[PDB]
Curated annotation (Swiss-Prot), chains A, B:
Protein name per UniProt: Protein doublesex
Membrane-spanning residues: none
Function in brief: Controls somatic sexual differentiation. Binds directly and specifically to the FBE (fat body enhancer) of the yolk protein 1 and 2 genes (Yp1 and Yp2). This enhancer is sufficient to direct the female-specific transcription characteristic of the Yp genes in adult fat bodies. Involved in regulation of male-specific expression of takeout in brain-associated fat body.
Domain of life: Eukaryota
Further information: Experimentally shown to bind zinc.
Location within or outside the cell: Nucleus
Section covered of the full-length record: 350 to 396 of 549
Length: 65, 65
């Protein structure tokens, strides 16, 4: 019923958290992102990445001049 | 999206960013979360919430504060 399945989950977060070196308070975010990407960092990172670029891109196109 | 497919998306993001008062640098995260919750803040917030509690909870059992 509840093996490491959860522990690993937080472990990936700490890793996704390390991959993006996010602060310790964004664990709830890293946590959800993985909940969607089946918890697969490689599959979860591709989202954040697009996100980082996505958001940044939205900032490049507009350059907030 | 070219029409109101992406813009709305960032709108929810900025809103989710406001609902949780997250800094402006977590738009890539608020962005992904919405990507999983059909972009519906209500369905997306429920995850974060469980997340905040989830992580916080994991912080109580082990007592990390």
């Amino acid at each position: 019923g509840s093996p490491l399945g959860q522990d690993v989950f937080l472990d990936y977060c700490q890793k996704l958290l390390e991959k993006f070196r996010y602060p310790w308070e964004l664990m709830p975010l890293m946590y959800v992102i993985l909940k969607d990407a089946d918890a697969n960092i490689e599959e979860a990172s591709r989202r954040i990445e697009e996100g980082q670029y996505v958001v940044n891109e939205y900032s490049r196109q507009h350059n907030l001049n």
